[PDB]
Design a protein around this ligand. Structure first.
Ligand SMILES: N#CC[C@@H]1C(=O)Nc2ccccc21
Ligand SMILES: [Mn+2]
Ligand code: NA
Ligand SMILES: [Zn+2]
Ligand SMILES: [Zn+2]
Length: 454
């Protein structure tokens, strides 16, 4: 009645052997965890990264948040000290409940969150921190710089030190030479009671991993990737305003929604309370939302395994259908990796080769179609040199890389090969196919991957 907690998500307690390599571990739990969307990981008892900071010297700009179910909020776009925020946060919780903050049961905060967001007359606003590491507020994990203690040095190269997750070998966002800071760097999150993250999935359907360094728990709700479309259909019926087209990526709309509402509409939802020292991992296209139980500090990062590559391709297709902007070009990433085939991990090479084959066959068919539309002239074009906003399809906003159509009538404008008719009124013989590679360039690149994969 009123609020029924979703079933608990899977919780894993890996041995040190099982834990050592995060990518091997994630691959192992995937058949289980991808059915629930989120899972929790408790590191071995001895894995204990040192956490030290001067709460008076760390400062950040707070964001402010109203807490109303189904109200549109904008996705976080890229002054308190940690001490003064903590004082505010503790006093808020203490005053809200007239209790000391740790004697407030997590069950009660959860119950009260879902009451207050649903109740029109309640007008609770809270503040929180969200940004990438900076000189003003750095990573909670050890980074190289400051003479480090031996304990700190021990965690510098940990696979679970989230600063490393991008630049590692089984990672794929690693190789992106395009600098997508907002997506590949860890985000730092200072939370307070009820501060909340709305239902969302990660850009390009990536994984994410979140570590709670310190503080009171973080309550999560997650939905498996197989039910993403189900969830969106529920959202569109109850909150249509979230689905209107938007000028760019810095304008995405998201919302708070009771998981019981999703469960009523047959969407599977799981929950967990993430405590200090625990990881939460979200899987590709797994919707998630949640809120903080009190003053805390978390760090999170996106990543992409080899398992994810086919889903990445599907995601960009989905973005095209929605006319949504891309964070990066998937094809550019694939070709960058092929161009480095000799130094790729061999399983990575094998998986990239398979995606590349699909890319090449799709590209071959698209080029045949636009030739039949009367586009005859062509010229090589180094798309990777163009700023992203100078190589988006006028129609579907996809980031071009393999090819595009241009016309001297509309200088600087491009369409992708799905939208040749959307560029201008000139007849197609006035158009040029701009292409990064010939088919004859591409097959050798794919062959290099095959040789590396052996
Ligand atoms: N995804 C996710 C959780 C992460 C967090 O731990 N706090 C916060 C606030 C806004 C957006 C995303 C987050
Ligand atoms: Mn997220
Ligand atoms: Na309300
Ligand atoms: Zn297009
Ligand atoms: Zn024209």
């Amino acid at each position: 009645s009123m609020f029924l907690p979703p079933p608990e998500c899977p919780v894993f307690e890996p041995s040190w052997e099982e834990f050592a390599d995060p990518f091997a571990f994630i691959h192992k739990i995937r058949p289980i965890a991808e059915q629930t969307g989120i899972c929790k990981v408790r590191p071995p008892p001895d894995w204990q990264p040192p956490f030290a900071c001067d709460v008076d010297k760390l400062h950040f700009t707070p964001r402010i948040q109203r807490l109303n179910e189904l109200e549109a909020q904008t996705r976080v776009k890229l002054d308190y000290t940690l001490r003064t925020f903590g004082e505010m946060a503790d006093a808020f919780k203490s005053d809200y409940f007239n209790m000391p903050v740790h004697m407030v049961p997590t069950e009660l905060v959860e119950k009260e969150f879902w009451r207050l967001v649903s109740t029109i007359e309640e007008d609770v606003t809270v503040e929180y921190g969200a940004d990438i590491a900076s000189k003003e507020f750095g990573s909670g994990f050890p980074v190289r710089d400051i003479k480090l203690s031996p304990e700190e040095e021990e965690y510098l190269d940990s696979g679970w030190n989230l600063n490393n997750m991008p630049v590692m070998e089984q990672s794929v966002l690693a190789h992106i030479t395009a600098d997508i800071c907002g997506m590949k760097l860890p985000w730092l999150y200072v939370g307070m009671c009820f501060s909340s993250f709305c239902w969302h999935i990660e850009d390009h359907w990536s994984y994410s991993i979140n570590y709670l360094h310190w503080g009171e728990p973080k309550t999560w709700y997650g939905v498996p990737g197989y039910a993403a479309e189900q969830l969106e259909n529920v959202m569109k019926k109850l909150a249509p305003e979230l689905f209107v087209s938007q000028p760019d990526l810095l304008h995405q709309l998201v919302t708070i929604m009771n998981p019981n509402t999703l469960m009523t509409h047959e969407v599977p939802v799981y929950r967990t309370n993430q405590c200090a020292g625990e990881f939460v991992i979200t899987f590709p296209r797994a919707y998630h939302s949640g809120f903080n139980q009190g003053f805390n500090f978390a760090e999170a990062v996106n990543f992409c395994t080899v398992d994810w590559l086919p889903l990445g391709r599907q995601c960009v297709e989905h973005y095209r259908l929605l006319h949504r902007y891309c964070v990066f070009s998937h094809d550019e990433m694939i070709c960058k990796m092929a161009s480095k085939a000799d130094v790729l991990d061999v399983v990575v090479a094998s998986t990239v080769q398979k995606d590349m084959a699909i890319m090449i066959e799709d590209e071959k068919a698209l080029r045949e179609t636009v030739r039949k539309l009367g586009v005859i002239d062509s010229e090589r074009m180094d798309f990777e040199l163009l700023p992203d906003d100078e190589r988006q399809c006028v129609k579907c906003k996809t980031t071009c890389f393999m090819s595009a159509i241009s016309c001297s009538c509309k200088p600087g404008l491009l369409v992708c090969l799905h939208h040749v008719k959307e560029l201008c009124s000139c007849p197609p013989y006035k158009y040029k196919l701009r292409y990064r590679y010939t088919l004859d360039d591409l097959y050798p690149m794919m062959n290099a991957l095959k040789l590396r994969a052996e």
